[PDB]
Amino acid sequence: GLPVMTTPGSTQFLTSDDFQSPSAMPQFDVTPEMQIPGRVNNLMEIAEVDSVVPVNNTEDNVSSLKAYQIPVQSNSDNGKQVFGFPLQPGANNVLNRTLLGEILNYYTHWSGSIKLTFMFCGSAMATGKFLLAYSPPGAGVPKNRKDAMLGTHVIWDVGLQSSCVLCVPWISAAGYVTCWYQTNIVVPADVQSSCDILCFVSACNDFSVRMLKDTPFIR
Amino acid sequence: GLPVMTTPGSTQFLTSDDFQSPSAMPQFDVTPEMQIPGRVNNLMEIAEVDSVVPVNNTEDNVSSLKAYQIPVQSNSDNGKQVFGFPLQPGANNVLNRTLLGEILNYYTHWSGSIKLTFMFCGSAMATGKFLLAYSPPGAGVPKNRKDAMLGTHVIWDVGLQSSCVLCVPWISAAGYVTCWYQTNIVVPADVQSSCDILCFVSACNDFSVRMLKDTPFIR
Amino acid sequence: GLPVMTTPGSTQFLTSDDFQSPSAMPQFDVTPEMQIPGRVNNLMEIAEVDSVVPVNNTED
Amino acid sequence: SRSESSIENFLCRSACVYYATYTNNSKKGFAEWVINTRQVAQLRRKLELFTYLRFDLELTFVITSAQQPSTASSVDAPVQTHQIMYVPPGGPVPTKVKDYAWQTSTNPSVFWTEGNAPPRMSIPFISIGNAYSCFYDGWTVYGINTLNNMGTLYMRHVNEAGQGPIKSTVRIYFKPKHVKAWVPRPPRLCQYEKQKNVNFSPIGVTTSRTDII
Amino acid sequence: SRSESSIENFLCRSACVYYATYTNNSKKGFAEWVINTRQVAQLRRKLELFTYLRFDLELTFVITSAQQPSTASSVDAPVQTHQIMYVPPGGPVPTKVKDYAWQTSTNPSVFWTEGNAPPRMSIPFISIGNAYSCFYDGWTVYGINTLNNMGTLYMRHVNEAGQGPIKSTVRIYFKPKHVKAWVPRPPRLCQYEKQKNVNFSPIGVTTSRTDII
């Protein structure tokens, strides 16, 4: 009849193939659909939301809710580092286990930028000023408030606005998001002085992920 | 269902086949192209450029830069052979390891012509005259300047032009490109007399190669 | 996928078959033709010419 | 390059979920696997990102043989043949190798000789509900949800051997198709302890560093 | 007749690049090959004419068997089955025959019984850069260029044998497709000394003759 000729690679089971398959149970007339809210078409839609970042690990707050609070008090020293963390990806940093770093550990190649939302979770009578210095990849970490001012920065007035948003690229040194005291925390009578700050992370524009792998957060 | 019938030669692995293949990693979305300068569409474009020919081997210049220089001095004899090499292909000749003879040793059948560019790498005060006799395949090598003049030749005046171009067919005796003194090298005071000559080879028109093989310049 | 069903006479080598064959050396660009005189399209054209007949055998 | 993070390219992969052995002569050699999603710890984490899923199923079995040590006298066996029976939710269940439940009519089973392509088959979306449920906060026993129950697979030989024993392994592969996902959830931090429930022991949030600066 | 010197007809050929043996019983019999271009001395010279290449890949494996001397008592084995696992750049790497890295999900592996057509598979162009780089004047260690790294191949049996040992060889074939070449370079004169770098010992330019005339 019709003459055929089989090529190599005929009776093999490639695990990533795409062939039609014989249905085990036909004639079933399956259950139709129902409009359930919250359909996810793409895994980036999970990474676009914001999540709290545990920037206060220090070896005994990791089994607590103190990991997310940045301790801010009115000290006596003029200018001091509040916090600071690198953006070196996956090397035990603080963006590792968050909702952004949980999806990006499934892929090996990714590129994009990042929203870094802060929030002052303190009283309404307390004022102050903060620097938010960002060092580029290649430049060192600033060791002083003055040459942290000479780099790119945002001066954050606490009494005016309660949240500062910062956009920054992040690629697979890789950067520093050090934050410094500008002035002390002025406070009235019968108000506590020790306030705290939360830190949020998200995905600003479209990331571009590629080359899926398995996750390393498993046995 | 559809009745088939397999011909002979079905489950065989011919090494020079052309069949479609199952992709191991689909769904990858590969890196797009980038316009890099210097794209090679055909291997003849490497053979069209010119290369220096080591026509001065003589058993101890091959591990030196003296292999490419033709020694030219003002002698006392009236008429003498400057150099000479056959065009017998691949039989340890001087066009063997050049950029032309490196591609043509990958193919067994080839046919075309050849540019032979010369250059006088001497002073600007020195003059002279040279013959460039070419003997055809079948005719012998000329043993004297007079019957080298009776064959086809080009008289090369050094004081007028500094480069002489010669076109010659080359096929897979096969020819001789012997070169003779016409007159001595006249030179003024306080100028050196021992000058040198380089030799270049290329592909003039389109070669026609066929029946690829592996190269013999390997263990 | 596409369901087939092999008939008898599948993996056999009939000597007078006519099937397409995998080329051993592709990409060769063979030598073109040249008009040579005296082309024979049919074997009867040899039999149409005349030949001398040995009608005088007689053993020596 | 934003398309490799789609749900179709993230969940339609193949994974080795089960691996069991069975021999013919030992009067209880046949395999068994209740089809679920909580078998291997890696695919469980990739499906626990969503709450309600809805997919078809496509399974492939790689069955191989191994000769057990027989007694003597020139053992030679013909090609073997295996039967892979699929029981729908609420069907007859076998308990021995020679049982009535193998010869039934409503259980679709494949038959496969050795030395050929591996026997794929495809299972549609069987449920009363409109989606599978990866999580269930409610009683049926707490957190069971009897509505997403896909069935059971059974494997055995169909050759009786008189001179030599033969044992065989089987690697069941798992591949969803036409996946739809709803109600995304945070990824699990703690390790997996049991198969049935969501039990855990509390662990720290992130690996620790020396100081805040 | 100028078309057989095209880049597609000059580089899209098949070559035996690797040849390794492995047996099943010896608890460390499995093959290994890091996919590179500098393996065989002839294909290395045909690709060192250009600096930047960009090709897909198509591999074919010719696997055959050989019976090792067993002890006694009428050995008879069924048809064998092999698994050829491909690890992408930055994936899990096995160290033993029974390991977790074989049963993973993101490594595409083929399964193949003996007595059929040889198991071809095709690997696309995987890189971050826009071309492969055959030469690299720069540090990562000098002249490594970690950007063109295509992966690793692993072969093993999936049958456990009780009565007879079986060893097997494998000949990996190599065939580029849809080749593009840039920045042509002079062919190498000296012999190849090492696999990683461009080390050499200086040799003369051309074989010598007696005199200039």
Added chain:
Amino acid sequence: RSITLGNSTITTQNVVVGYGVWPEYLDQPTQPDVATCRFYTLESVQWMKNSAGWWWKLPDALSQMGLFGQNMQYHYLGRTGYTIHVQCNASKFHQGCLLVVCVPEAEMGCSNLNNTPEFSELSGGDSARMFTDTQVGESNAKKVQTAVWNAGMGVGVGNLTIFPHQWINLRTNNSATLVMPYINSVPMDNMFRHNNLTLMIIPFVPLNYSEGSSPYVPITVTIAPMCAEYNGL
């Protein structure tokens, strides 16, 4: 004649451009042009009778050269083109022939057969490393195998005309001029761990003069970057 760029001026009177393309432009990149586009003239080497050759690594030679050395350290990535002016001045009584090549990705080989050459032996910052006409011994610490007839790259030195080149023959010509685009696989690469070019000068027919003439001919190499752009905020 008398071309100027920035605050520097040279004087010329034939230019061979790249692989046929002129150098042009493409987080977001920044494009500085005022403080980089100028003629950085390296110091002059001497061509004697028994000379062998010189080589420079091109995005290494301008590493201490003015503000271009500041943009190499302060910025992480970047891409450049080049415009190389070579001119040697000899009288009408001298003779010789130079070959001026600009090789992309000239990976060189060590004299010791097991190691790779160390950092100080491959590139001198605005100082020419030199060829030899012999072998370099193997049992030393770490050096480059720099026999001139194999060009340090294991390749026959006659075939180096396939890269973009130009001849300087003292009988007729005096100078060379090359214009080289950015040739790399990635569109923007680091400038400290990678030298994408290599400028070579090899005397095929060596220098000669009579007794009385000046016994050296100085060579002057003048490089000017074209269409540079970096990556930073």
